[PDB]
Amino acid sequence: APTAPSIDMYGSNNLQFSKIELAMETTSGYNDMVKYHELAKIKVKFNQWSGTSGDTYNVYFDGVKVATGAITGSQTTASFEYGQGGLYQMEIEACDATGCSKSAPVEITIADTDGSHLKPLTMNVDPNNKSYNTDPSIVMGTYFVEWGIYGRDYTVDNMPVDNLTHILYGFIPICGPNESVKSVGGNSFNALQTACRGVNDYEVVIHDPWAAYQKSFPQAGHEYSTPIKGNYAMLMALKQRNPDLKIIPSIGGWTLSDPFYDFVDKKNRDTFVASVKKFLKTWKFYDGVDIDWEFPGGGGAAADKGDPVNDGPAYIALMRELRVMLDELEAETGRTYELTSAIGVGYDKIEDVDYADAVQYMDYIFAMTYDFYGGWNNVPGHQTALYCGSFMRPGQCDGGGVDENGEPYKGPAYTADNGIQLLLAQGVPANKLVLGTAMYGRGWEGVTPDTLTDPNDPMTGTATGKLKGSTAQGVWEDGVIDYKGIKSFMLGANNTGINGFEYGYDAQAEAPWVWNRSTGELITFDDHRSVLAKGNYAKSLGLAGLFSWEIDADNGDILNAMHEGMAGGVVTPPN
Ligand SMILES: COc1ccc2c(c[n+](C)c3c4cc5c(cc4ccc23)OCO5)c1OC
């Protein structure tokens, strides 16, 4: 028999092969950093110094023959291609007419972006996240933000994944006009310039490749030489742990929506839809696409953009075209892909899209039932209420009234029910709507008791400016505080108020607040009671479920209340 092959581990690159080439100690254009191959190129060097070498080799993975080739004297390189990622026990055999001889087995890894080579992620979840047996039809969604791994120190293994059906990964940018990104300051706009070098306008890219796939997380077992790292390798291992979890990239958002306004031109839609197909073929752990255009018709971050006439039909065409592309991917892969969108729910946002036409292409609409009031001006109100608060004026809720100056309201007030009823009345199916919950507050200072027109209600006061605070308090920008900051600095464990704050609840609106009458600090947020109200409301109307922005800001209380308020319910999943 031939001499048994002896595998050269070092010069077969210790048997780590990857279908994706990712650039590692550099930051460059997306097309220079990311290259995906349908088949991994496997090159394994072996030698046979004593004896006869034979004529032909065979390579086996877990005892099944996967490749064959010619022996070349004393040193051969087995070269072949392989599609399926995984961990395999490889042996190499040399054969001639006298017989065959095989190497010792050795583990080969073929990395792919579905995480087929990875073990289930080890989790490190705050134990205040409790266990529920919510029916699997109900959507329990949240957004995980790519930048949460920095100051916020919240990583994929912190997510309470057994309590989630859908994770929206925020946010994938679109190359092109992106002036709005400069409003976040820092290196965000420059990082996008770098990512888009050599990329066509209106194609998707990864905004921060360090966070997405370069950074080594010791809790995930990453080493500096591991071929896929970052949040994306953790999401691939999370999918190995929880295979029914849907992980969806969210394209756009408040700061990254400026390129959508050029989708009035079909050529730019076609460039975008092709780039998304290519993205989902590259990053196989993703299960569809979420489009967060804020907003058709304008009123987002770009004051100079928005076309009430033309953006709606462009959004509908985009959805049509994306569902054609996703059906191509379902035919190619045999998988199911979801198409979703987060939308504004103010009447002036909903009137700009004919949702009765768009929703036929969509699996779910994530209704952004939050940010109704905030520190952008000095008018207090409930940022995430279901219904109209006691602070509002006669006829403000339905929009038939006049304001304090006698001027007509232009539409119904910003509440979750006004927006959900406007979507339902035009024929959007309840079972496609997912109601949003806020894991943060918005706030003001300067709301002192003398400014209140009703002394029992701080929402009738007037502010002097935004809430101010530090990042240890969960204030990452003025006017916005993490829920877990409100719990540590304003509520306390018994929910009865600390540090000079008092708790109140508008039982008509279904909306909580904390108020420090000394400083005039007032914060509008969601809490256990108001999230139980939203789940009861979702069960009453047959909505798909609930989602939240953003998971790093919860301490478990808000996701627990999302499950508690949906207990017992089931829903028909959209077809
Ligand atoms: C990226 O995170 C976010 C998420 C939502 C917002 C935001 C910034 N601004 C100014 C607003 C905002 C600003 C408004 C407004 C309404 C608004 C509603 C939502 C956001 O009325 C007029 O001024 C933001 O930060 C850049």
Coordinates of C-alpha atoms in Angstrom, one line a residue, residues 14-489:
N14 CA -4.0 24.9 9.9
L15 CA -7.2 23.9 8.2
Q16 CA -9.3 27.0 8.6
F17 CA -11.0 27.8 5.3
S18 CA -13.6 30.4 4.8
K19 CA -16.1 31.2 2.1
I20 CA -15.8 34.9 2.9
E21 CA -12.7 37.0 2.7
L22 CA -12.8 39.9 5.2
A23 CA -10.2 42.5 5.5
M24 CA -8.9 42.8 9.1
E25 CA -6.5 45.5 10.3
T26 CA -7.6 48.2 7.7
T27 CA -10.8 50.2 6.9
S28 CA -11.5 50.7 3.2
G29 CA -14.3 50.5 0.7
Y30 CA -16.9 47.8 1.2
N31 CA -16.0 46.1 -2.2
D32 CA -12.4 46.0 -1.2
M33 CA -13.1 44.6 2.3
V34 CA -15.7 42.0 1.6
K35 CA -15.5 39.2 -0.9
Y36 CA -17.9 36.2 -0.9
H37 CA -17.3 32.9 -2.7
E38 CA -20.1 30.3 -3.4
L39 CA -17.5 27.6 -3.0
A40 CA -14.6 27.6 -0.5
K41 CA -11.2 26.8 -2.0
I42 CA -9.7 24.1 0.1
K43 CA -5.9 23.5 -0.4
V44 CA -4.3 21.0 1.9
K45 CA -0.6 20.1 1.7
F46 CA 0.6 16.6 2.5
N47 CA 3.8 14.6 2.1
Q48 CA 4.8 10.9 1.8
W49 CA 8.6 10.9 2.4
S50 CA 9.2 7.1 2.9
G51 CA 7.9 4.4 0.6
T52 CA 5.8 4.6 -2.4
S53 CA 3.5 7.6 -2.9
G54 CA 0.8 6.0 -5.1
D55 CA -1.2 7.4 -7.9
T56 CA -4.3 9.1 -6.6
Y57 CA -5.5 10.7 -3.4
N58 CA -9.0 10.9 -1.9
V59 CA -10.1 13.3 0.7
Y60 CA -12.8 12.3 3.2
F61 CA -15.0 14.5 5.5
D62 CA -16.6 12.5 8.3
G63 CA -15.9 9.3 6.3
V64 CA -17.5 10.5 3.1
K65 CA -15.4 11.1 0.0
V66 CA -15.4 14.7 -1.0
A67 CA -12.5 15.1 -3.4
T68 CA -10.0 13.1 -5.5
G69 CA -6.8 14.0 -7.4
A70 CA -3.4 13.0 -8.6
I71 CA -0.5 12.2 -6.3
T72 CA 2.6 14.3 -7.3
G73 CA 5.6 12.4 -5.9
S74 CA 6.7 13.1 -2.5
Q75 CA 4.6 16.3 -1.8
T76 CA 1.1 16.9 -3.0
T77 CA -1.4 19.7 -2.6
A78 CA -5.0 18.5 -2.5
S79 CA -7.0 21.4 -4.0
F80 CA -10.8 21.3 -4.4
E81 CA -13.9 23.4 -3.7
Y82 CA -16.5 22.9 -1.1
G83 CA -20.0 24.5 -0.6
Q84 CA -21.2 23.6 2.8
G85 CA -19.8 25.3 5.9
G86 CA -19.1 23.2 8.9
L87 CA -16.6 21.4 11.1
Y88 CA -15.5 18.1 9.7
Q89 CA -13.1 15.2 10.5
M90 CA -10.8 15.1 7.5
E91 CA -8.6 12.2 6.3
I92 CA -6.5 12.0 3.2
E93 CA -5.9 8.7 1.5
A94 CA -3.3 7.7 -1.1
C95 CA -4.1 4.9 -3.5
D96 CA -2.5 2.7 -6.0
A97 CA -3.1 -0.8 -7.3
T98 CA -1.5 -2.4 -4.2
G99 CA -3.9 -0.7 -1.8
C100 CA -4.6 2.6 0.0
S101 CA -3.4 4.2 3.1
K102 CA -5.0 7.1 5.1
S103 CA -3.7 9.9 7.3
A104 CA -4.8 10.4 10.9
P105 CA -8.1 12.4 11.1
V106 CA -7.9 16.0 11.7
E107 CA -10.6 18.7 12.2
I108 CA -11.1 21.0 9.2
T109 CA -13.3 24.1 9.5
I110 CA -15.2 25.7 6.5
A111 CA -16.6 29.0 7.6
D112 CA -19.7 30.4 6.1
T113 CA -21.9 33.3 7.0
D114 CA -24.9 31.1 8.1
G115 CA -22.6 30.1 11.1
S116 CA -22.8 26.4 10.1
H117 CA -19.2 26.1 11.5
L118 CA -20.0 27.7 14.9
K119 CA -21.3 26.3 18.2
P120 CA -24.4 28.0 19.8
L121 CA -23.5 31.3 21.3
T122 CA -22.8 31.3 25.1
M123 CA -25.2 33.9 26.5
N124 CA -24.7 36.5 29.3
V125 CA -28.3 37.9 29.8
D126 CA -29.4 40.1 32.7
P127 CA -31.4 37.7 34.9
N128 CA -34.2 40.2 35.4
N129 CA -35.3 39.0 31.9
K130 CA -37.9 36.4 32.8
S131 CA -39.2 33.2 31.1
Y132 CA -42.5 33.1 29.3
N133 CA -44.4 30.7 27.0
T134 CA -45.7 33.3 24.6
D135 CA -47.2 31.7 21.5
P136 CA -44.8 31.6 18.7
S137 CA -47.2 33.3 16.3
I138 CA -46.8 36.6 18.1
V139 CA -44.1 39.0 17.1
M140 CA -41.8 40.1 19.9
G141 CA -39.3 42.2 18.1
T142 CA -36.5 44.6 19.1
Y143 CA -33.6 46.7 17.5
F144 CA -30.1 45.9 18.3
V145 CA -27.8 48.8 17.3
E146 CA -24.3 48.2 15.8
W147 CA -22.7 51.0 17.9
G148 CA -24.1 49.5 21.2
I149 CA -20.9 47.6 21.7
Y150 CA -18.9 50.9 22.5
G151 CA -20.0 53.2 25.4
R152 CA -23.3 51.3 25.9
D153 CA -21.3 48.0 26.4
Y154 CA -24.1 45.9 25.2
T155 CA -23.2 43.0 23.0
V156 CA -25.1 40.3 21.1
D157 CA -24.7 37.8 23.9
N158 CA -26.5 40.2 26.3
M159 CA -29.8 39.9 24.3
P160 CA -32.6 37.9 25.9
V161 CA -32.9 35.9 22.8
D162 CA -35.5 33.4 24.1
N163 CA -37.8 36.3 24.6
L164 CA -37.5 37.6 21.0
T165 CA -38.8 36.5 17.6
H166 CA -37.2 39.1 15.5
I167 CA -34.0 41.2 15.9
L168 CA -33.7 44.2 13.6
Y169 CA -30.1 45.2 13.2
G170 CA -29.7 48.9 13.1
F171 CA -28.6 50.2 10.6
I172 CA -27.2 49.5 7.2
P173 CA -26.5 52.7 5.2
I174 CA -27.1 53.3 1.4
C175 CA -24.3 54.9 -0.4
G176 CA -25.1 58.4 -1.9
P177 CA -26.4 61.7 -0.3
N178 CA -26.0 61.4 3.5
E179 CA -25.7 64.9 4.9
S180 CA -28.0 63.9 7.8
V181 CA -25.3 61.6 9.2
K182 CA -23.3 64.7 10.1
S183 CA -26.0 65.6 12.7
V184 CA -24.6 62.7 15.0
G185 CA -21.2 64.2 14.9
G186 CA -18.1 62.1 15.5
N187 CA -16.7 59.9 12.8
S188 CA -20.0 58.5 11.5
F189 CA -20.1 60.5 8.2
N190 CA -16.4 60.0 7.5
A191 CA -16.7 56.2 8.2
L192 CA -19.5 56.1 5.6
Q193 CA -17.3 57.9 3.1
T194 CA -14.7 55.3 3.6
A195 CA -17.1 52.5 3.3
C196 CA -18.5 53.9 0.1
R197 CA -15.1 54.4 -1.7
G198 CA -15.4 52.4 -4.8
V199 CA -19.0 51.6 -4.3
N200 CA -21.8 52.7 -6.6
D201 CA -24.3 55.2 -5.2
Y202 CA -27.5 53.6 -3.9
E203 CA -25.8 50.3 -3.0
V204 CA -25.9 49.1 0.7
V205 CA -22.6 48.9 2.7
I206 CA -21.6 48.1 6.3
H207 CA -21.1 51.3 8.2
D208 CA -18.7 50.1 10.8
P209 CA -16.8 47.0 9.8
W210 CA -15.0 46.9 13.1
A211 CA -18.2 46.4 15.0
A212 CA -19.7 44.2 12.3
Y213 CA -17.0 41.6 11.6
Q214 CA -13.4 42.6 12.8
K215 CA -13.6 43.1 16.6
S216 CA -12.6 40.0 18.7
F217 CA -15.1 39.2 21.4
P218 CA -13.5 36.9 24.0
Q219 CA -16.9 35.8 25.2
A220 CA -17.7 34.3 21.8
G221 CA -14.3 32.5 21.7
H222 CA -12.9 34.8 19.0
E223 CA -9.2 35.0 18.4
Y224 CA -7.4 37.6 16.4
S225 CA -7.1 35.1 13.5
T226 CA -10.6 33.9 13.5
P227 CA -12.0 34.6 10.0
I228 CA -15.4 36.1 10.9
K229 CA -15.6 38.1 14.2
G230 CA -17.6 41.2 15.4
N231 CA -21.3 41.4 15.9
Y232 CA -22.0 39.4 12.8
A233 CA -20.1 36.3 13.9
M234 CA -22.0 36.5 17.3
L235 CA -25.4 36.7 15.4
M236 CA -24.4 33.7 13.3
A237 CA -23.7 31.7 16.6
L238 CA -26.9 33.1 18.0
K239 CA -28.8 31.7 15.0
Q240 CA -27.2 28.3 15.8
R241 CA -28.6 28.5 19.4
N242 CA -32.0 29.7 18.4
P243 CA -32.7 28.6 14.8
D244 CA -36.3 29.9 14.6
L245 CA -35.0 33.5 15.4
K246 CA -35.4 36.0 12.5
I247 CA -32.5 38.5 12.2
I248 CA -33.3 41.3 9.7
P249 CA -31.0 44.1 8.6
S250 CA -32.7 47.5 9.0
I251 CA -31.8 49.8 6.1
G252 CA -32.0 53.6 6.8
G253 CA -33.4 55.0 10.0
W254 CA -33.5 58.7 11.0
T255 CA -29.9 59.6 10.1
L256 CA -29.4 57.2 7.1
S257 CA -32.6 57.9 5.1
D258 CA -31.4 60.6 2.7
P259 CA -30.7 58.3 -0.4
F260 CA -34.3 57.0 -0.3
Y261 CA -35.6 60.4 -1.6
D262 CA -33.8 59.6 -5.0
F263 CA -35.8 56.4 -5.4
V264 CA -38.4 58.4 -7.5
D265 CA -36.0 57.2 -10.2
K266 CA -36.4 53.5 -10.9
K267 CA -32.7 53.2 -12.0
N268 CA -31.7 53.9 -8.5
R269 CA -34.2 51.4 -7.0
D270 CA -32.8 48.8 -9.4
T271 CA -29.2 49.5 -8.2
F272 CA -30.4 49.3 -4.6
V273 CA -32.5 46.1 -4.9
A274 CA -29.6 44.3 -6.7
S275 CA -27.2 45.3 -3.9
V276 CA -29.6 44.0 -1.2
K277 CA -29.8 40.6 -3.1
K278 CA -26.0 40.5 -3.1
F279 CA -25.9 41.5 0.6
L280 CA -28.2 38.7 1.6
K281 CA -26.3 36.1 -0.5
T282 CA -23.1 37.3 1.4
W283 CA -24.5 37.4 4.9
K284 CA -26.5 34.3 5.1
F285 CA -27.7 34.6 8.8
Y286 CA -30.0 37.5 7.7
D287 CA -33.7 36.5 6.9
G288 CA -35.1 39.4 4.9
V289 CA -34.9 43.1 4.8
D290 CA -36.4 46.0 6.8
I291 CA -36.8 49.3 5.1
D292 CA -36.8 52.3 7.6
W293 CA -37.3 55.3 5.3
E294 CA -37.9 58.2 7.6
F295 CA -40.0 59.4 5.8
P296 CA -41.8 59.4 2.5
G297 CA -43.0 62.9 1.9
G298 CA -40.3 64.4 4.3
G299 CA -40.4 65.5 7.9
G300 CA -37.3 63.5 8.8
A301 CA -33.7 64.6 9.4
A302 CA -33.3 66.3 5.9
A303 CA -35.3 69.5 5.9
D304 CA -34.7 70.0 2.2
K305 CA -36.0 66.6 1.2
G306 CA -39.4 65.0 0.8
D307 CA -42.0 64.9 -2.1
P308 CA -45.6 64.2 -0.9
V309 CA -46.7 63.4 -4.5
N310 CA -43.9 61.1 -5.5
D311 CA -42.4 59.4 -2.6
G312 CA -45.4 57.1 -1.8
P313 CA -45.5 55.6 -5.2
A314 CA -41.7 55.2 -5.1
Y315 CA -41.9 53.4 -1.7
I316 CA -44.7 51.1 -3.1
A317 CA -42.6 50.3 -6.2
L318 CA -39.5 49.6 -3.9
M319 CA -41.6 47.2 -2.0
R320 CA -42.9 45.5 -5.2
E321 CA -39.4 45.2 -6.5
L322 CA -37.8 44.0 -3.3
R323 CA -40.5 41.2 -3.1
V324 CA -39.6 40.1 -6.7
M325 CA -36.0 39.9 -5.7
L326 CA -36.7 38.1 -2.5
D327 CA -38.8 35.5 -4.3
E328 CA -35.7 35.0 -6.6
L329 CA -33.7 34.3 -3.5
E330 CA -36.4 31.9 -2.0
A331 CA -36.3 29.9 -5.4
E332 CA -32.5 29.8 -5.2
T333 CA -32.1 28.8 -1.6
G334 CA -35.3 27.2 -0.6
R335 CA -35.5 29.6 2.4
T336 CA -38.3 32.0 3.3
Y337 CA -37.4 35.7 3.3
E338 CA -39.4 38.5 5.1
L339 CA -39.9 42.1 3.9
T340 CA -40.8 44.6 6.6
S341 CA -40.7 48.4 7.1
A342 CA -40.8 50.7 10.1
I343 CA -43.1 53.6 9.4
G344 CA -44.2 57.0 10.9
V345 CA -47.7 56.9 12.5
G346 CA -48.5 60.7 12.5
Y347 CA -51.4 61.4 10.2
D348 CA -49.1 63.6 8.1
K349 CA -46.7 60.6 7.6
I350 CA -49.4 58.0 6.8
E351 CA -51.2 60.2 4.3
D352 CA -48.1 60.2 2.0
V353 CA -48.1 56.4 1.3
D354 CA -51.0 54.3 0.0
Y355 CA -50.4 51.5 2.4
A356 CA -53.4 49.5 1.1
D357 CA -51.2 49.0 -2.1
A358 CA -47.7 48.5 -0.3
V359 CA -48.7 46.1 2.4
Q360 CA -49.6 43.4 -0.1
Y361 CA -45.8 42.9 -0.6
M362 CA -44.9 43.1 3.0
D363 CA -44.8 40.6 5.9
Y364 CA -45.0 43.1 8.7
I365 CA -45.2 46.9 9.3
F366 CA -43.4 48.0 12.5
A367 CA -45.5 51.1 13.5
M368 CA -43.2 53.7 15.2
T369 CA -45.7 54.5 18.0
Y370 CA -43.2 56.6 19.8
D371 CA -41.4 60.0 19.5
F372 CA -44.7 61.8 19.5
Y373 CA -43.4 64.6 21.7
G374 CA -39.8 65.4 22.7
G375 CA -37.0 67.8 23.6
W376 CA -36.8 69.1 20.1
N377 CA -39.2 71.8 21.4
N378 CA -40.5 73.0 24.7
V379 CA -43.9 71.5 24.5
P380 CA -44.5 68.6 26.9
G381 CA -46.6 65.6 26.0
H382 CA -46.7 61.8 25.9
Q383 CA -44.2 60.4 23.5
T384 CA -45.6 56.9 23.2
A385 CA -49.2 57.0 24.4
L386 CA -52.0 54.9 23.0
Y387 CA -54.6 57.5 23.4
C388 CA -55.0 61.2 23.8
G389 CA -53.9 62.6 27.1
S390 CA -55.7 64.8 29.6
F391 CA -53.3 67.7 28.6
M392 CA -54.7 67.9 25.1
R393 CA -57.3 70.6 24.1
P394 CA -60.9 70.1 23.0
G395 CA -60.9 68.7 19.5
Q396 CA -57.1 68.2 19.5
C397 CA -57.4 64.4 19.6
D398 CA -59.5 64.1 16.4
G399 CA -58.1 67.4 14.8
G400 CA -61.5 69.2 14.6
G401 CA -60.5 71.8 17.2
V402 CA -58.5 74.9 17.3
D403 CA -55.3 75.6 19.2
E404 CA -54.7 78.2 21.9
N405 CA -54.3 80.9 19.1
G406 CA -57.5 79.9 17.4
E407 CA -55.8 78.1 14.5
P408 CA -57.3 74.8 13.3
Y409 CA -55.4 71.6 14.1
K410 CA -54.2 70.2 10.8
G411 CA -54.9 66.5 11.7
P412 CA -55.5 64.1 14.6
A413 CA -53.1 64.3 17.4
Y414 CA -50.0 62.1 17.6
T415 CA -51.1 59.0 19.5
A416 CA -50.7 55.3 18.7
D417 CA -54.4 54.7 18.3
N418 CA -54.9 57.6 15.9
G419 CA -52.2 56.2 13.6
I420 CA -53.2 52.5 13.9
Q421 CA -56.9 53.4 13.1
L422 CA -55.7 55.4 10.0
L423 CA -53.8 52.3 8.8
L424 CA -56.7 49.9 9.6
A425 CA -59.3 52.2 7.9
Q426 CA -57.6 52.0 4.6
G427 CA -57.4 48.2 4.6
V428 CA -54.0 47.4 6.2
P429 CA -54.5 44.0 7.8
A430 CA -54.2 44.0 11.6
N431 CA -52.1 40.9 11.5
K432 CA -49.4 42.6 9.6
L433 CA -49.1 45.6 12.2
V434 CA -46.5 45.4 15.0
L435 CA -47.0 48.1 17.8
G436 CA -43.9 49.9 19.0
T437 CA -42.8 50.3 22.6
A438 CA -40.2 52.7 23.8
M439 CA -37.2 51.5 25.9
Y440 CA -36.3 55.1 26.6
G441 CA -37.7 58.4 27.7
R442 CA -37.7 61.9 26.2
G443 CA -37.5 64.8 28.6
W444 CA -37.3 68.5 29.4
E445 CA -36.1 70.7 32.1
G446 CA -37.6 73.8 33.4
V447 CA -41.2 72.4 33.7
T448 CA -41.8 74.0 37.1
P449 CA -45.1 73.9 38.9
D450 CA -45.9 77.5 38.2
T451 CA -45.9 76.8 34.3
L452 CA -48.9 74.2 34.6
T453 CA -52.3 75.2 33.4
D454 CA -53.7 72.1 35.3
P455 CA -51.8 71.7 38.6
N456 CA -52.3 67.9 38.7
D457 CA -50.7 67.5 35.2
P458 CA -47.1 68.4 34.3
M459 CA -47.9 67.8 30.6
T460 CA -49.8 71.1 30.8
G461 CA -46.6 72.9 31.7
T462 CA -43.8 74.5 29.5
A463 CA -40.2 73.6 29.4
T464 CA -37.1 75.7 29.1
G465 CA -34.9 73.1 27.4
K466 CA -33.9 69.5 27.0
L467 CA -33.2 67.1 29.9
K468 CA -29.5 67.1 30.6
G469 CA -27.5 64.3 32.1
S470 CA -24.5 62.0 31.8
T471 CA -23.9 58.7 30.0
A472 CA -23.8 56.8 33.4
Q473 CA -27.4 58.0 33.9
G474 CA -28.3 56.6 30.3
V475 CA -28.3 60.1 28.8
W476 CA -26.4 59.7 25.5
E477 CA -27.9 62.8 24.0
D478 CA -29.7 65.7 25.5
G479 CA -33.4 65.1 25.8
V480 CA -33.2 61.2 25.7
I481 CA -32.6 58.8 28.6
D482 CA -32.4 55.0 28.6
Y483 CA -35.3 53.2 30.5
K484 CA -32.7 51.5 32.7
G485 CA -31.5 55.1 33.5
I486 CA -34.9 56.2 34.5
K487 CA -35.3 53.2 36.7
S488 CA -31.9 53.8 38.5
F489 CA -32.1 57.6 38.7

